Each structure stands twice: as C-alpha cells, then as structure tokens.
Design a protein around this ligand. Structure first.
Ligand SMILES: [Cl-]
Ligand SMILES: [Cl-]
Ligand SMILES: [Cu+2]
Ligand SMILES: [Cu+2]
Ligand SMILES: [Cu+2]
Ligand SMILES: [Cu+2]
Ligand SMILES: [Cu+2]
Ligand SMILES: [Cu+2]
Lengths: 285, 285, 285
C-alpha cells in the first residue's frame, strides 16, 4: 500500500531526566525521539518534511529503510521550507532514521532521531510477539552548542529514549516509566543505536535474548545470545521471554554507559497492563 | 542433574602482573578470575553465595546462564550474610558471571568476575576438542577506589585472566605461563569479555578461528574468521587449529589493548603436556 | 597454483590529505596502503620481504590469510635484510595484512598495512560483482613519532585508504577521487579496518548492504544490513546495489570518525567509467 508521512523539524525545549531538567533540542514533531514510523515491507512511503519557520537551522531527513540519492533526497532545507520524497520499503526489519544536516553529529545529539519499523510481508517470518517496545540509545551532551565536546566524545549521559534512567524506577525513585509483560510472553524489542558516537553491548540482566535479528531481518536470526553489539547508526530486533515473575534490566553492558543512564527495567507480572507494549504504547513517553 | 555451587565473596590482595605487583581486589573465592563453573545443559544449579565476615562491602552474584528475577535473586547481601537461589541452565554455551552490586563498574573492575560453561546436552553438537582454555578479558585500573577514572575509561592495562602479559613469555621475560597444544589438535577457547567498559577484537596472530560460536551456542556457528568482536559483558567459543609447530598469539587487535597486556601465546609442539588444557587446567593460574 | 609476492619495506614521505600535506611514513612498496595482493583459495603463496638499506627501523610481515608460526615467520628483519616464507591460502575471503614489528601500534599507524583478497575456489559461491572496490580504514596521528598519543587513542583523523576525505568531493571540493557504478550493478566492497585502535560501523547513506560476508567467507552471509561493525584488525565483504541514479555515502557511522574524514562517495551514473572498479582500479589512488 501507499502511506503518507509528514514530519516537522521543530526546535524546542524538552526534558532529558527525571527531575524535569530541560535542554534546547532539535526534534521531529517536538519530541525526542521522533514519532515511530511503521509500514509493511513493499509499502510506498510518501514522505514530507516541513522545517518550521521559527527554526534557526537547516534540517533534513535520512531513512535507513530508504534507497535513494543522498545529494538530492537527503539535502538540508532552510527554515520555512518544505521537502518531499517517495521510497518503497524494500527490506523488512528495524531501521534508524535521523537528520543528515551539517554537522550530523550535532543534529543527532540534539535529538533529531527516530525509528522506522518495516513489518515483513510474510506475517509468519517472525514468531508472534505478545509485547513490542522501542528503545533508542543516544549520548546526551551537556552543552548542545559545543561541537568540540561531541567530536572528543565527551558526553555526560548515555540514555534510552532521550531520558537519563527513564525506565529505571529501581535505581531512580523519581522514574515514572517501565516496560511491562507477563511471564511466558514473547517480548519484542526494537532497538536502535542513534549514537552519534558510542557502542551498545545490549544485555538483559537476569535473562537472555531468545532471538536476535541484525537489522531486524528474519534471515539473519541468531539464538540465545547473552549480549549483542549494536554499533552507532545500527538497529536490531531482540526477543525476550521470562519463565518467572519479577524483573529484568536491559542494559548497555559497557558499564560506564549503564552507570550514566542506560538501564531499562522490564517488569514481569501476572496482572500486567493489557495496553502496555501494544497499539500506540510501543514507545513509552 | 542437580549441581551444588558455593562461592565466597572475598576481599583480598592479588597479583596483577609478572613482577609481583598487587592490588586490593574484590573476588570470588580469593582469586581473579573466580572459579570455573561447568555444568550440562538442562542441569539444575543450586547456588550459594557467602559474603565473608571481614568484607567491608555488600556483594551479589549475576549469572548470564540464569533466567531469574534481578530484584530478589541478584540482590546485594551484607558481610556475614548468605544468599541462595536455584536456576536451570536452559541454554548451552559460555556465559559471563559477576557481582552485580553498586557500583557494578567497580565490583567488576576490582575482580569479581568469572565464567560458567554450559555443555550441550547433545555431546556431538560441537566437534570434538582436544584442548580447552578459558580466557577472560578485563581492564585493570591503577587505583581500585578511583571511580572517576573508571567512568572516564582511563585504565592502565587490558589483561587476560587478571594479569598483565600473563601468558606472554615472548614479550615479558618474567612470564611463566602459556597455552599448549599439538599441531592438528582442535583447541577450544572459552572467551569472556568482563569489561567493565571495553570491547575486544580477538585475533590469533599467524592463525585463524576455525569456528566461532556467539555465546557458545552451536546454532550460531561462524566459519573461518580472522577476528571476532566480543562486547563488554559478552562471551564466545572460538576454535583454533594449527597445521604446523611453533606459536600463535591471541590478541585484542585494538593494538593499544594488546600493547598494554592483552596478548596470550599458544605454543604448538609435539611434546605438549598431556595435562595442559584438560581436566581442571583449563584456566591456567 | 603457485604465486610469487615480493614487497619492499620503504620509509618515505607520502601525502595524507587533499591539500597535499605529507608525513614521514612507513610503507610497503612506498605507498599507503600497500599493494593489493590477490590469489585464489588453495593457492600456494611464496612471499618475499625486503627491508631497504636506507630504512631506520626493523620491519616484518603479517598475513591474516596465513596459518604459520609467529616467532620465526613473522619475525622482524633489520634494514638491508630479506625474509622468505611460503603459505597456502586455506580459506576464501578478505584478509588484513600489516607489519608486526615493535611497536606494532606505530608500524600500523605509520602506514604499513594492506589487504590480501582470496577468491573462492567455487566461483559461484559469491554472486557476480560488476564493480570491486577496496576501502581500508585507519587512524592518522599528527606526530608519527608520538607513541604516547597512539597509546592514548588521540588521533587527528579517521581515514579511508590513507587520505583525509579522499573519496568525498561533495564535502571537500579539493577531493579528486570517487567510486563509480551504474544503477542495478552489484558493487562489492572489500573493507579492512587496519586500526590500529578504532572500530568502524560501516553504513551506506541512502543505501543498504545487500549482503555482508564476515571475513569475506561465503558461509557467513548476512542479508540487508543497514550497518556492519568491523573491529580493529578485521575485514569484511559488503555488497551494494543502487536502484536509481545519484549518490551514496559509505561512512563510519560513529559520527566523530566520519566528521574527521571517514566518508567515501559512490556515484551511480548511467555512463560510469567502464575501467573503474575493475582490473587494477579496485583500490583508487
Ligand atoms: Cl578455576
Ligand atoms: Cl563446577
Ligand atoms: Cu536537523
Ligand atoms: Cu544514518
Ligand atoms: Cu561485589
Ligand atoms: Cu552482566
Ligand atoms: Cu614496520
Ligand atoms: Cu593483524
């Protein structure tokens, strides 16, 4: 089928921790990360980017699910300009999308990143998921304007979905979000490493990845991995099943990353919220 | 079968190089790395952790081979406390174990790590190995109390099995240990990257990895790799076969890691010790 | 069949950027990277290394395609001396070669690196390539004598084939080289991360990797990957097909690397040069 996706380049203040601390973010649609885009393999995506008039910077859009021309299709547009392009989603899986404007390092770091999920045309290529969660890793830099610190990889925090310990009520008592499932259910994690610089060695504490799909593609399946390496600008699908009640903690096992904020708690309870990990609750804000 | 495994959390001085330099380590059973735990797939592991009365810190245990609750099972216990939990080793392969107490970065860095090997229920899933060797990579930090240096990733050395150039008599004249095999033998390396922070690009100089199993799982088999990436908190099984007499040098090919201590020499000779890499000489201490 | 390979350890000045800046380099045959070596699976390689009399340092050779003894075969020879060894290429794919003399970190960093390509015995194992290109990533250091800076991972640029923005004329107008292909053609990238320290997260901007082969081995085939991690001292074979005219940008997606010069542009035009990416044009100099 054909789908219309319109997104705005919005420069606004967003919270980045549990105590309500804000920063001057560059965003898609006024939020970090950007909205989840979900299509089926083979779908035609008609995309539109509107750079808001009140922006002070040129912005662009790069989809990893797209096969196009970088020069003309991914070009930067001025504040008050509108850009359009069309692409088919040829390959199934999970894909990084982000702004590609100069310098990309700053545009990604300030929050211009998201995920596009491409469902396989064969609905039985992947085992049925009972829950779905989007987690995007990024480095937070204290000063959004300091490009030298970004080049020197001097980040302040490594975060999931734009928030320091966003999904960690165990470590941060002021956290208000966490992942939910029942024991026995298959939990599908759509993981993207936005970077711009760092690695992610993703591990579920007190559990194991039942299956891992590099770029989310069914052909690339790997089994019973304790950890998986997701490089900067890469994405993967990871499945998790708990045999018991309690919790797992999804972490970047490079410990200084985890200590700085990269920990997500998933609670396995018999009375789990039926709306959690389903419908439009896949990325928890 | 049911296997009883008991470990003590011991805070003691251990050597970290060949010149006899020591540091105040946190350990399992007073050694770095901790004891090798070996079971068969499907076994019931009854685990017990005793935190020694003379310890000054709380300690815990995290098995990557276990599927449990992080909150209750992997909880910190005080000195003079004893903790028990039971898990089944559901998946075959090679798994990282470590203390999971606060801060996890420091508990690992000070030496609280080890390996649990889970032999496949099907004894013919893996090709017959003639030698077996455990190698665990970790970063050594000059001051075990300086948590800022750990967060900044400012290690002094990258080491195998707790010692600077522990298995390299070629570079270090004070090194007494090395790996042994005969030409044509299949040498199985159980590799764990304990971290806490760094990645490992493992390569056998003058050799090639015959087979590589991500997380040690046979289903994930990879053929004839020159190098394999093991992330922090990850593990893999790697097979090596030399057609000639002489030596190979297993290195972390990120050369600043290798230069700082991450080189292990395997000698291929016809008069190789029949006890080497067998029984319980698999982790050479 | 048997092939003769002779290389000279040459210490001479070479350019490393588009503005013509030079540095005192250590090289094979007087160029960075060294010459492309190409054989077939099963071929016997009779290798010869000559260290030039005007050289100030000892040099050696390490082939990742060779299964030998590190002590005798990969030994360092003094200026004016000659080293000879013979090996078979037992495994097909793409392999890193470099000098392995002390300190190995400096010898690699100063330019003593290249690639040996081993074509599969089964000519059908890989789908037919219409274009072939060699890209070798390395770090450039401002002062080639500063071993401490190399040990601290303090590089100036992350480069492809020795040059800062060598294949990026869109970003840098003084760049005189770029990759060429037609739409629909299969472009095969033989990629090597020489390091000596850094990791690469290779992604084609506005494209996708059709197939990826770890170590270049057909048995390890991966499909439709947006990115692929190549550790230091590792190599991979990556296929790229563009459905349309325009451009793609092959980048190390760790943005600090890409911003420092790790971007290579491939132009997809209907009348692309028929000599490009074929014969001896595979490594553009
Ligand atoms: Cl032991
Ligand atoms: Cl045991
Ligand atoms: Cu932007
Ligand atoms: Cu990207
Ligand atoms: Cu501890
Ligand atoms: Cu762990
Ligand atoms: Cu050299
Ligand atoms: Cu090498």
């Amino acid at each position: 089928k054909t789908v219309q996706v319109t997104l705005h380049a919005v420069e606004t203040d967003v919270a980045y921790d549990n105590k309500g601390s804000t920063y001057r973010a560059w965003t898609f649609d006024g939020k970090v990360p950007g909205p989840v885009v979900r299509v089926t393999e083979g779908d035609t995506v008609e995309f539109t980017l509107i750079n808001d008039k009140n922006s002070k910077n040129s912005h662009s859009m790069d989809f990893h699910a797209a096969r196009l021309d970088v020069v003309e299709d991914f070009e930067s547009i001025k504040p008050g300009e509108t850009k359009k392009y069309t692409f088919t989603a040829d390959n199934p899986g999970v894909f990084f999308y982000h702004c590609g404007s100069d310098p990309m390092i700053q545009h990604i770091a300030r929050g211009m990143y998201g995920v596009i999920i491409v469902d396989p045309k064969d609905a039985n290529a992947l085992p049925k998921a009972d829950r779905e969660y989007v987690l995007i890793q990024a480095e937070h830099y204290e000063n959004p304007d300091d490009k030298t610190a970004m080049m020197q990889n001097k980040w302040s925090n490594v975060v999931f979905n734009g928030g320091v310990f966003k999904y960690d009520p165990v470590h941060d008592s002021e956290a208000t979000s966490w992942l939910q499932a029942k024991p026995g259910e298959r939990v599908r994690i759509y993981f993207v490493n936005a970077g711009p610089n760092e690695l992610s060695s993703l591990h579920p504490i007190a559990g194991i990845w039942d299956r891992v799909y590099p770029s989310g593609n069914p052909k690339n399946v790997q089994y019973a991995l304790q950890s998986y390496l997701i490089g900067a600008g890469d994405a993967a699908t990871l499945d998790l099943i708990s045999p018991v009640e309690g919790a797992n903690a999804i972490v970047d096992h490079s410990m200084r990353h985890a200590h700085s904020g990269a920990i997500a708690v998933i609670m396995f309870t018999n009375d789990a919220d039926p709306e959690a990990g389903r419908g439009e609750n896949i990325l928890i804000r």
